[PDB]
Subunit: 207 residues, 4 copies
C-alpha cells in the first residue's frame, strides 16, 4: 500500500540516520511499548514471546517451546510475564461476543475470571478489567512455575526466577504484582500472598 510504501520509507530513513540473552519476556500482542523501550535493555539481552493477553497456557506448544528453549538451551535465569493496562485481549475476553477462533484462546482468561469471581463480583463493574489484567499476570506466572520445564529446572538446581509485572500506559512504570518464584515453595507462597493482597478492595469500589 501507500501504508506499505510509507513503512519502507520510514525504515530506510531510520536505518540511514542510524551477545547472550538474559531474559525471556512474555508480553501481549496489543501492548504498544516494546520490552526494549520499557527496560532500556541492550539489544540481544531480550528473548521475547508475544501472544494475546500474555498467556502461559498449560498445553500451548508455541509458548512452552519458547520456555523450554530459553531455560534448557539458552540458560536464561529470568522469565518475566508482563501485562499492561488497557489490554484489548482482556477486554475481548470479558465481552459477551462471538469473536470466532480467538474466543477459544480467551476462554482461559474467562476461567481465571470465574476462579476469582467472588473478588471480581465484589468490585464495581468499570474497575474489573484492570483487576483481571493484574490477576491474569499472577495466574500466568503460577502456570509458568507449574510447567514440567520449570519444575525440572528447579529440581536439578538450575537458577531460575519467574516474575510477573504490569505496566500502566499512563506512567510507564513496571509494577510488580507479587508473584516472584525461585522454587516451587516460593511459587506457592508468593502466589497466595499476591492474590490475598489483590483481594483487598478499595472501599469506594465495593458493591
Amino acid at each position: 500500500m501507500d501504508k506499505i510504501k510509507q513503512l519502507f520509507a520510514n525504515n530506510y530513513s531510520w536505518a540511514q540516520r542510524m551477545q547472550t540473552p538474559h531474559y525471556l519476556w512474555i508480553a501481549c500482542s496489543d501492548s504498544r511499548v516494546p520490552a526494549e523501550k520499557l527496560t532500556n535493555l541492550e539489544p540481544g539481552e531480550l528473548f521475547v514471546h508475544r501472544n494475546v493477553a500474555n498467556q502461559v497456557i498449560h498445553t500451548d506448544f508455541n509458548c512452552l517451546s519458547v520456555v523450554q528453549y530459553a531455560v534448557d538451551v539458552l540458560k536464561i535465569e529470568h522469565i518475566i510475564i508482563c501485562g499492561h493496562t488497557n489490554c484489548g485481549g482482556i477486554h475481548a475476553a470479558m465481552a459477551d461476543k462471538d469473536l470466532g477462533l480467538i474466543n477459544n484462546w480467551l476462554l482461559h482468561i474467562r476461567d481465571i475470571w470465574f476462579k476469582h469471581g467472588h473478588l471480581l463480583g465484589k468490585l464495581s463493574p468499570e474497575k474489573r478489567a484492570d483487576m483481571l489484567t493484574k490477576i491474569n499476570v499472577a495466574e500466568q506466572v503460577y502456570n509458568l512455575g507449574r510447567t514440567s520445564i520449570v519444575k525440572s529446572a528447579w529440581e536439578r538446581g538450575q537458577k531460575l526466577s519467574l516474575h510477573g509485572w504490569v505496566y500502566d500506559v499512563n506512567d510507564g512504570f513496571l509494577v510488580d504484582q507479587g508473584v516472584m518464584a525461585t522454587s516451587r515453595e516460593t511459587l506457592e507462597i508468593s502466589y497466595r500472598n499476591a492474590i490475598a493482597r489483590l483481594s483487598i478492595l478499595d472501599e469506594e469500589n465495593i458493591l
Copy 2:
C-alpha cells in the same frame, strides 16, 4: 537480581525522562530490533506476535488465534512476516543436536530445508543458514495464505495483503522476499516466482 534491580532502575529513569492497529507483525523471538524501531511506526499501529523462527504452523492455535483475531475482529489489512539474519532459531533448526521440546517446533524448519534440499545442497555450507532464513519467510507467507482464516477473508472480498520480509542486522534495511499476496492466485504466482528467484545461486557459492 541486581539484573532485575537494574531493570527497574532503567525503567524508572526511562519513564521519568519521557488508536487502531493497521498491521499484524509476525517476528522471531530472538530478533533484537522491535517492529516499532524498524518501521518507526506510531505506538498502537502494530499488533505483534513473536515465536521462534517466525513460523506460521498450520495447526498452531497461538499464531492462528492471533491471525483470526487480527483479520476477523481487528480488520487489519496487512500481515507481515519478518525474518532476520543471524537467526538463532534457524541455526538451532540446522544443528544436529537434541535440544528437547524445541526440536519438535523446529522440525517444520527442517521440513522446509528438505523441501528445498536440492537448492540448499548446491550451495556452499556456510551460506545455507542465510538462504534457509529467506526461504523460511517465503514458506511462512505461503502457509499464512493457505490458512482457513485468510482464504475465507479473501473469498468474502475482505482486503488483505500478506508480506514476507527479512532484515539484515548489518544495515537495518527491510528486504522484501517476493511473496506478496492479496488473493490465492497472487499467492501462488508470487510464491513460485520468489522460490525461482531465490534458487538462482551466485556462481562463487555453487558446489
Copy 3:
C-alpha cells in the same frame, strides 16, 4: 517382534474367518471397552476421538478440529464424552510424580481437582479418583459447550446435543453425569445441577 508376528497372525486368521456417522465419541486413550461394544452400534455410526483422560482442552487444535469437522461437515447431532473408572490418566494427574511432558497435559485435570477441592477433600481417599473422573466428564461437557464451534452451531439453529457419561469397568453400565446441553442455557443449568448433585454425598463415600 514375535509380539508383532502374532498380531499379524491373529489378524490374518480373524479376517479370513469373516455410511453416515451420527455420533462423535470422545473417550480416554486408556479405556479398555471400545465405543461399539459399549453401545452395540453398527460400524460407521461412530466417529471417535481418544485422548488421555478424555479432555476437551480449550485450545487443543486436535480435538477442536475433530469437533468442528463432526459438527460443521459431518452434521453430527450428538457428541458424547465418556469417562471411565480406574482411569490411569486421572490417577496420573492426581499423583505428584514428575512424568515429563504429559504432566502439562494433565495440569488441566489438576485445575479441575483444585476447582472442586472442598468437595473432593470431604471424600474418602479411595473414592476420590472415581469422583474426579465424574467431575472431569461434567467439566469437559462444559468445555465442549463453550467452544466457538458448538456455540455458533447452536446460534445458527443447528440441532446439536452434548452428553457426558461414565462407565464402571467392573460392570460396564453407562451412567449419565447430568450435564446435557442442547443450547448454552441448558448447558449452564444442567452443569450447575450436575455439580450440585455430585456435591450431595452418600455417607459411604464420606471421609
Copy 4:
C-alpha cells in the same frame, strides 16, 4: 433423543448379558473397525489415540503427550500407526472445499500430497486417495520417529519399535507399509525403501 435412549437400552442389555498395555495404537477417527477387533488382543493391551487421518503432527501437544506418556511412563515398546482405505479424512484433504477449521489440520496431508505429487500424478484418479492413505502412514511413522521423545528414548537405549500399517475396509487384512524403525538409522533406511517401493507402480494402478 430416542437415539440416546436406544443407546442406553442397548448398553443396559449388553452389560446385563455379561493390566499393562504393550502397544500404542494411533488410528483414524473415521476408522470403523476397532483396534481390538483387528488384532484380537485382550482388553488392556491397547493404549489408543484416534485423530482425523491418523497424524503425528510435529507440534500437536495432544498426540505428542500420548506418545511421551506411552513411551516414558507406560514403557510401551511398540507404537503402531494404522491407516485405512476409504478414509474420509484423506478424501477431505484432497477436496478443494472450504470445510473451515479442519482444513488447517488437513493442510499437513496436502503438504504430503504435494511432496509426492509426481508419483501421485502418474496414478489413476480413482486409486490416488488410497495411494495417499498409504504414503500418509509412511510419513507419520517418519514423523513419529523424528520426535524428541522417540529419538531420545532410542538414544538412552530404551527398546522401542515403530510400525505403520493400513487395512482395506473391504477385507480387513493389515498390510505393512514398510517403514519400521527400532532406531534413527533404521527409520531413515526403511522410510527411504518404503517410499521407493510405493513408487514402483503395478500398471493396473497406472494412469
